[PDB]
Design a protein. Structure first.
Lengths: 416, 416
């Protein structure tokens, strides 16, 4: 169920319909570079670093191959397979040219496809109202790619795709799976499933353009070839925070650390330009790089947009629990975990997943079955921010198998 | 699984956290209107039509109730339940105020939620960098709602929701179903399923804000109460274009009308500010009203954005077919239909569905089974536009049960 335009799931060349054999070619040229075949004037000399050429198409050559990354606003970022730089409109010496530059992004890297008919289109830069074509209509000559306004004299700007590459290492997306309740404990010695062992539900997954994935091992020129999209998974599991055998009437104290640490948020921001907002464990904040794709990322990952100006942090609660049963009882206490995992197209993990422990959704397993522990008291030891300072109303009975979610009736501000 | 913020699936009041009993109130006042409780100066006199009041909240009064419609860019359009008008920033007499106006839309109708903590937020107008609050911090007085820049001694702009309405007539969305192949024919008398009888697959469905649904029966003040969202369904079915018994070696001619009528496109544009682009039967063109929601509409309806400057039209093909079997054979010919249906929250249909017949995807049923008809020749009789003038390469064998899709190998321009 992949809802992308065909230009976004392949590489393609770009050519004037009036050119026999030439296509748009990525150059590493400098100002003063001579286009030998061109008539004299503005079409003969490069005015900018990394102009595009009207080159005889070489089959299999990455310098002619482009992928169109689809923005939420229906425009495209157009990246080349040779080095992963993107097309950009630029004025140098009063001449409108197409260059290749690193993804910024900026409005001059956004292109509009204007389809004239089934196989013919124009590449529109909407900010300048210009269309990409060959300098002075020299359609069969070595010269630069320009971007010009429509006038009577203007070179025809009708383009086509000359060649396609359809084998591009698209990822295989995992199937959605529901979050199951944890099994019952089987004996006193059963501590339940540890976080490493707990099954993950796949709640959502989205493609991420490789352009702003700071993969610590793959540089951009290799990402665009091997993993033009990455996969971000939204997973959930039941995370055990502690387990112990209690004697009849035994009282114990635990330090419960929930949320997500500052170092994990900084790693997530560096890697994909996204953080978890303080307003919830499924609430995403977007930076400048990820913002143009935010609605697709939210829709496909089954998260929500964050409205917070602060990131989710850690909180340490001191919890006092009392075994109010006259039996020896195994207690195992779990909170819901949100796990964000990034993989390459080959399925390889890019680093350690980012995990938010949600203190507001909690479950209990006991042996024997159907035992209940008393939550005597909760106190905040410390928190990284003041966004969520609610605590459980105590005393509270936690029963085997019963999920408790925070609401107006079972919680209060810490100072009441 | 509805992926919307909680503010988008309920109505809520808006209040200063520093007000005992007052909330934002929709007024139908004129310039010169006197706020009796206000101290003298800019807070006492209305400067614009339809200012907002700081009114003692009346429970169940629609003049205090707002729904937040979520834009693709993570901002909101805020509509009131009394008349369906939306909040807007306005400068009149050098004073920044909040007014209510008809959905346009414009950038001054876009509000950003800035969540400070769990139950406190600010309403940000990002173009002007202003925040909504009560004039001169008169939090317990009858006066107007202003929108001011943050300065030392600016009125505190921390807000809350005082009251909620959660029973709002949200639609119950249909389940997605797959498109099944048509059954085999059972005898010579079996003409197969007519278009009225063919089962529909539900390929996608999306919520549409009532603000730009030109319901022919329900005015805006009634839509916002009864159907704050409408449902747009993307359905598919197999549409029978003809069926006949052929004698051995019999030749016949059919006029096949495909695409969508201009009158149906105009009706769709008037109703929801969307048309089907000429680049495909699932390709949507958005006007000024629907554009701010386009990525949500595409993602949820499982359609694609159109790149065409032309709407899908009708085309009439003359097809010559030949029964190349030495048997009497029942032939039934089908094309794929795309059916777009709009319903209110109560499930009632707003108009006749909009149907695109796709000439490029075709199936055949025969009796007896496993028979093949010859497509001798295809000619275009007329078309509404020149966007797609491809025809089948003939002769072409159409086989019982075999779906044929247009590609580069089996089609050509009509003039070749």
């Amino acid at each position: 169920n992949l809802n992308l335009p065909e230009q976004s799931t392949r590489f393609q060349t770009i050519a004037s319909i009036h050119s026999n054999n030439c296509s748009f070619e990525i150059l590493n040229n400098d100002p003063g570079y001579i286009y030998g075949d061109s008539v004299d004037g503005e079409c003969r000399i490069a005015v900018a670093h990394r102009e595009l050429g009207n080159g005889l198409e070489r089959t299999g050559d990455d310098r002619f191959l482009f992928i169109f990354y689809a923005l939420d606003n229906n425009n495209f970022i157009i990246a080349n397979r040779h080095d992963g730089f993107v097309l950009q409109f630029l004025i140098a010496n009063g001449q409108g040219v197409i260059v290749s530059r690193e993804y910024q992004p900026n409005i001059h890297q956004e292109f509009t496809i204007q389809s004239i008919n089934s196989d013919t289109f124009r590449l529109h830069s909407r900010d300048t109202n210009t269309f990409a074509t060959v300098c002075w209509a020299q359609f069969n000559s070595w010269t630069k790619i320009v971007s010009r306004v429509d006038n009577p004299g203007a070179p025809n700007a009708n383009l086509k795709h000359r060649s396609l590459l359809t084998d591009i290492n698209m990822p295989q997306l995992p199937s959605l799976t529901p979050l199951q309740p944890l099994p019952r404990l089987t004996e006193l010695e059963d501590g339940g499933l540890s976080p490493a062992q707990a099954p993950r539900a796949i709640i959502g997954r989205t493609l991420i353009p490789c352009l702003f994935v700071n993969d610590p091992v793959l540089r951009l020129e290799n990402r665009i070839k091997q993993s033009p999209y990455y996969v971000l998974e939204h997973r959930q599991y039941w995370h055990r925070i502690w387990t112990d055998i209690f004697t009849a009437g035994e009282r114990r104290e635990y330090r419960e650390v929930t949320g997500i640490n500052n170092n994990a948020q900084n790693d997530m921001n560096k890697m994909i330009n996204i953080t978890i907002g303080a307003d919830g464990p499924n609430r995403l904040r977007f930076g400048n790089l990820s913002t143009p794709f935010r609605q697709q990322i939210i829709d496909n990952s089954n998260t929500l947009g964050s409205f917070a100006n602060t990131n989710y942090g850690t909180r340490t609660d001191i919890v006092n629990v009392f075994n109010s049963e006259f039996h020896q009882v195994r207690y195992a206490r779990f909170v819901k975990a949100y796990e964000y995992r990034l993989t390459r197209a080959d399925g390889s993990q890019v680093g350690t997943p980012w995990v938010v422990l949600d203190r507001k959704e909690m479950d209990l397993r006991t042996y024997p079955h159907n035992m209940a522990i008393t939550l005597e008291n909760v106190k905040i030891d410390n928190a990284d921010n003041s966004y969520d300072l609610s605590i459980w109303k105590t005393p509270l009975k936690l029963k085997d198998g019963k999920i408790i979610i925070e609401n107006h009736e079972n919680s209060k501000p810490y100072y009441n």
